[PDB]
């Protein structure tokens, strides 16, 4: 039986290490008038803006490329015992499954 300690070491998130400028692939799951909720797959979903190039080619279920900046935007302020989580992620659009 494979326990948790062995299956965690072979996780792609462990192989990626820090989330600073990592190239990842994410599949869109919801569409807004101009915003795109792309789930790169780690914990949260990043909100990106529809570019002017091939903006119509972005539909529900499309896989796109991202450069992950931060995994979960959390920070502290004055008089806050905990942090203020944004419940999102930070990522930018580069391409849409160039293959």
């Amino acid at each position: 039986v494979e326990s948790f300690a062995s299956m965690l070491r072979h996780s792609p998130l462990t192989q990626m290490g820090p989330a600073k400028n990592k190239l990842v692939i994410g599949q869109i799951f919801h569409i807004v008038e101009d915003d795109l909720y792309i789930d790169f797959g780690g914990k949260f979903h990043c909100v990106c803006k529809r570019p002017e190039v091939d903006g119509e080619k972005y539909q529900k279920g499309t896989r796109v490329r991202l450069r992950l900046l931060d995994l979960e935007l959390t920070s502290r302020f004055l008089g806050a015992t905990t942090d203020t989580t944004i419940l999102e992620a930070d990522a930018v659009l580069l391409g849409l499954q160039e293959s």
């Binding site: 948790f4 965690l8 820090p18 914990k43 979960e72 959390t74 905990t82 942090d83 989580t85």
Partner: protein
């Protein structure tokens, strides 16, 4: 009445009376992003014994104890559904409110994902009706509401002597939940996995209750 007590005493003598171990595994929980939590700064103090570590700020949950608590929670959930217990899925989160309500509809149990009213469970004889039947079990799929504060039902259940089975993230307070399960309630795959687990745990319990009643009808 002498034959009806046997129906209730039958499942109490066996450990896995409904065979709930095959419904999931450590790998099935790992594949649903359950082992992932918030950053170290958002860590609640009562999650240090329920955390496995911290991978560059982000904490990791121990899936062994996760699966053990999940086994216990699913057993307690199946027994309530077998004993004809009112199960209420209370979860205030504007991302899967539709999925939770659909799961409750398919299970035949009740749901609550809208604005939780103040005197709902306490002042029930004035909010619901003259004399009502309170939910025998409360299931939490999101302990924290949109204000990042503990829900009201998680305290009202303990105030009205009602058992609670809740998914607690790294920023939730499991001090009052009867059967807590340290996991992730922010991932769509995680919430789908929990919804399906409770779905099958309710379905098998109800079907086995019906089979036991059918057998009781032929007992005499």
């Amino acid at each position: 009445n002498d034959l009806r007590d046997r129906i209730l005493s039958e499942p109490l003598k066996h450990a896995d009376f409904f065979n709930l171990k095959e419904l999931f595994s450590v790998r099935s929980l790992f594949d649903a992003r359950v082992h992932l939590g918030h950053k170290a700064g958002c860590r609640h103090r009562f999650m240090e014994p329920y955390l496995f570590g911290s991978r560059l700020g982000q904490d990791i949950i121990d899936l062994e104890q996760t699966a053990a608590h999940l086994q216990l929670a699913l057993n307690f959930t199946a027994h309530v559904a077998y004993r004809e217990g009112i199960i209420l899925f209370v979860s205030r989160h504007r991302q899967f409110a539709h999925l939770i309500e659909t799961t409750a509809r398919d299970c035949g149990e009740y749901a609550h994902t809208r604005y939780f009213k103040g005197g709902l469970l306490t002042n029930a004889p004035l909010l619901l009706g003259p004399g009502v039947r309170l939910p025998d079990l409360i299931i939490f799929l999101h302990t924290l509401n949109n204000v990042f504060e503990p829900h009201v039902a998680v305290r009202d259940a303990a105030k009205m002597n009602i058992p609670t089975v809740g998914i607690v993230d790294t920023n939730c307070n499991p001090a009052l939940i009867t059967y807590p399960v340290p996991g992730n309630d922010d991932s769509p795959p995680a919430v789908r996995l929990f919804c399906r687990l409770f779905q099958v745990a309710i379905s098998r319990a109800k079907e086995k209750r019906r089979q036991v009643e059918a057998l009781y009808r032929l007992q005499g």
